[PDB]
């Protein structure tokens, strides 16, 4: 494709080949769990370079990506509405946590290390990974975009002449312009059951030449093929009823979010219309040609029309005198002894509701936005919510594992085998709201003390002190010995 | 070529054809024949004799009037069949009696 | 018996049913003498039609 | 008959031969309550390995999966619907609990074992199985799908040239891409009861030919027969009123989920339609051929139409200026004295609710999702729910126990006979949230402490200290003696 | 369809490409009737060219 990606191709081609070397065969369905859109291809003997690409590019490009565009557009439109904005804010706030002079996302390398100093190298790289996002200042925004859009992608930079020192700051890719694909690179007797290596690369789309609310978009119109190694990315493990139609967390609320604002708007238009007085004059203009017939109607209007309008700039009636009528005296000069020329009034903006149904709908929406029921101590709802946030962080986390292994491998700090054994678990942790974290511990302590207090009369009779520490205070034995030793020291 | 959907995948034939298929080495080989073992020839137990080369489903036409075979194609779908049978009503029992003489 | 081993069935839910079919047809008017099927399995495609 | 699966074909055939040597004969029964579809074959047909192709073709005209597809597609949408989705989330959350510096479901071999070396190997193998499934990261997703779909399947991978060592990671098979079948290999003098081993194999399929929203472009073409032994699977003990139709946990919601949706939308439509002002103008255009009559109508409607629009992006009225009239004064005319020209005003989506029905149905629905009524201390409802969660866990778990058996057996660590003797019980224990566990135990202890305290005055007179320790504190005899030993030493 | 790997492709990023060939020649004049290609497989070497 382009030599521009040569260092990545080297990484991607090797990974592909190593995967092919494993006979993961006799597998009917392609070995795909989630993510990328596969395009079945076939090959003569082993591969059909650029033949497959023609068929793949056109076969996947034409019938596709419309859905992706719509989902993103929808999610942004959703985000821009009242209380969605807040729900997103709350998630982002809880998900990306930092405070004055405290911890930030951090690489907790507490597991076995190579010698063991590799940890210093990894920690230094980690700091740069954050610097390459400017996470410490923009982390909230990167997260929000991922959460809201369901996905995020960044281009990785290689020197490329001296690639070991070449990793630079990341380049975010436009939403709706990324197609993640896989190829089923095999065909054989009765349908391929041959190792499915796929390559797993991306297609960079360009030229979103359409429109959006109050604007137009522009780009190149080219389709660029990339192996995978070149891009840092993440996406939610959320798929709609069909295929690999990847959706966001915001997807679930699209329905009710819109019907709710629709109901609110319906109430508003209901209240607005009919608010001013309304009435039609009926006029008998018969036995005349239209040329003259119109005079009866035109006359009544010209002299008796209520030409008065409300001043909404200043609370007054526009330039009227005297200050206010006691009655509106109207009259008609009847052409005959018949009630044919008259005024027929219409109903006003009556207080029909009971504008309460809307309360059910809003309640339902708040919840639907993935927020605690209590938002408009310790509870199951909070614990549940916190677990959700933690999982969002885990999904997002790849953004710091990917560029990390990338430069460690590009530079010559870590080998592929070492990465594979370290992780496993090199989990990047995050800070949690300190107020609530301390509160949680405080509540725990109070309960533990109350239990100890009640237990107390028998701590020297039925339950030992060590046992009480282990069951009442939920202490480990090492913890118990440490507490006893510190007490002994203090006692002297 | 004729259907555009797929090659023949079954054979229905005179028992004699089957006797031959079952007694010849159907694989790619020098030359060979012997007693029939390759397919069932016994219509007592089935119609389905076996699969020729692992490729065609072979059946016995026990009523062939002379000696013949038919080869054909059936796809994975119901539309790709050539021949259709939409039963709508089938083998529905009737039970009662005629009370005039009350026989079943 | 092997009555349906090689037969499509799609049992009807009414008597006297129907089936539809579609041919891709070229030459402007799909209904015409000499009209031709674009993906006819036996007859070859016309390469001049989209070209010279 | 694909040789590609020979390693498992061999396992199934050996099992079958062992069944052939068993005397569990003279059985009218299909020998199965919940499992594979029933078919019959002659023994002479069955004798050929290609009988599978033949039976597959028969089964193709009684598709099986078509029904399961309709059920699953329904289940997928129920999961997708708000106030269904969340119940599933809570269930999944409790079924598989994750925490920092905490274990995950693990194999607890505290029961009789053939050997401690095997024990060590099995524990490591169990871990490799979880690693293969990426359980530590995706265990809850696999579970969710299982709960909703009623089942999960996975394709096993064997080298197969070194099928002791080349044991590779599972490929999740999506329900609807697979069916479980069983054949009667026998005939007799009207009513065969001859040993029916059945083999119980699987058939692979897939189809995107039918309607899809997106992301679906594949079809199995021919179907593939897979040895039982080649598939890891689990399913809930939930079946239909007939056959072998496997039912998901949300099947209960099929009725009320949609009843609620139906009512909700009806309420919304009711409220929106007829919310804004609606009115019909009438013009007396009589004694004209029709096209001519219209001129009179146009002479009125082109002046009467209130060509004003409500802006829902910004709450404004388009073409309103000046700010707002005190009244809407219209003039309508007639060519005779006949009161025919007029304007009608129309309803009026009145605030009739009494929005109580939708609420009753929502509560009923929510309960139907197998959740506590306390959801939107420790109670019977919570305990009942926990029992439910364990029931789910103990069916799901086949997903780990099956490959555990297979891998150990292939390696040559265990024999099948040994497997059958050890299990019995090689229970894998699931992690449960320690927060709630602590609360439960603490409450239990509080009550026990209070009982002890109250008993105290006659603990040395009518009942003993031992009595209280075993009856109130619910200690075992060993527990009492050991606890005392520790107390006595602490007292020194 | 038949794969296009039965032939070369050289897809282009522009219309109208060109191909250059380097034909080794002999007989003191690159452009002449009778001039010959040094490595044309149909013909043997001119066995006496540098010789008799």
UniProtKB/Swiss-Prot annotation, chains A, D:
Subunit structure: Homododecamer. Interacts with the large terminase subunit. Interacts with the major capsid protein. Interacts with the capsid vertex protein.
Principal cellular location given in the protein's record: virion
Keyword terms of this UniProt record: Capsid protein, Coiled coil, Host cell inner membrane, Host cell membrane, Host membrane, Membrane, Viral capsid assembly, Viral contractile tail ejection system, Viral genome ejection through host cell envelope, Viral genome packaging, Viral penetration into host cytoplasm, Viral release from host cell, Virion, Virus entry into host cell
Localization annotation: Virion; Host cell inner membrane
Family: Belongs to the Tevenvirinae portal protein family.
Record function comment: Forms the portal vertex of the capsid. This portal plays critical roles in head assembly, genome packaging, neck/tail attachment, and genome ejection. The portal protein multimerizes as a single ring-shaped homododecamer arranged around a central channel. Binds to the terminase subunits to form the packaging machine. Attaches to the host inner membrane most likely through interaction with host yidC and forms together with chaperone gp40 an initiator complex to form the prohead.
InterPro entries: Portal_Gp20 (IPR010823)
Compositionally biased intervals (Basic and acidic residues): 482-492
GO cellular component, one term: viral portal complex
Residue ranges the record marks as coiled coil: 468-492
Protein name stated in the entry: Portal protein
Cysteine pairs bridged by disulfides in the record: none
UniProtKB/Swiss-Prot annotation, chain B:
Post-translational modification: A proteolytic cleavage by the prohead core protein protease gives rise to the mature major capsid protein during virus maturation.
Subunit structure: Homohexamer. Interacts with the portal protein. Interacts with the capsid vertex protein that forms pentamers. Interacts with hoc; one hoc molecule associates with each capsid hexamer. Interacts with soc; this interaction reinforces the capsid structure. A total of 960 subunits of the major capsid protein forms the 160 hexamers.
Family: Belongs to the Tevenvirinae major capsid protein family.
Primary role: Major capsid protein that self-associates to form hexamers, building most of the capsid in association with pentons made of the capsid vertex protein and one dodecamer of the portal protein. The major capsid protein self-associates to form 160 hexamers, building most of the T=13 laevo capsid. Folding of major capsid protein requires the assistance of two chaperones, the host chaperone groL acting with the phage encoded gp23-specific chaperone, gp31. The capsid also contains two nonessential outer capsid proteins, Hoc and Soc, which decorate the capsid surface.
Name assigned to this protein: Major capsid protein
Organism of provenance: Enterobacteria phage T4 (Bacteriophage T4)
Entire-sequence positions represented here: 366 to 469 of 521
Curated annotation (Swiss-Prot), chains C, E:
Superkingdom in the source lineage: Viruses
PTM comment, free text: A proteolytic cleavage by the prohead core protein protease gives rise to the mature major capsid protein during virus maturation.
Protein family membership: Belongs to the Tevenvirinae major capsid protein family.
Task of the protein: Major capsid protein that self-associates to form hexamers, building most of the capsid in association with pentons made of the capsid vertex protein and one dodecamer of the portal protein. The major capsid protein self-associates to form 160 hexamers, building most of the T=13 laevo capsid. Folding of major capsid protein requires the assistance of two chaperones, the host chaperone groL acting with the phage encoded gp23-specific chaperone, gp31. The capsid also contains two nonessential outer capsid proteins, Hoc and Soc, which decorate the capsid surface.
Subunit structure: Homohexamer. Interacts with the portal protein. Interacts with the capsid vertex protein that forms pentamers. Interacts with hoc; one hoc molecule associates with each capsid hexamer. Interacts with soc; this interaction reinforces the capsid structure. A total of 960 subunits of the major capsid protein forms the 160 hexamers.
Protein name (Swiss-Prot/TrEMBL): Major capsid protein
Residues represented out of the complete protein: 106 to 157 of 521
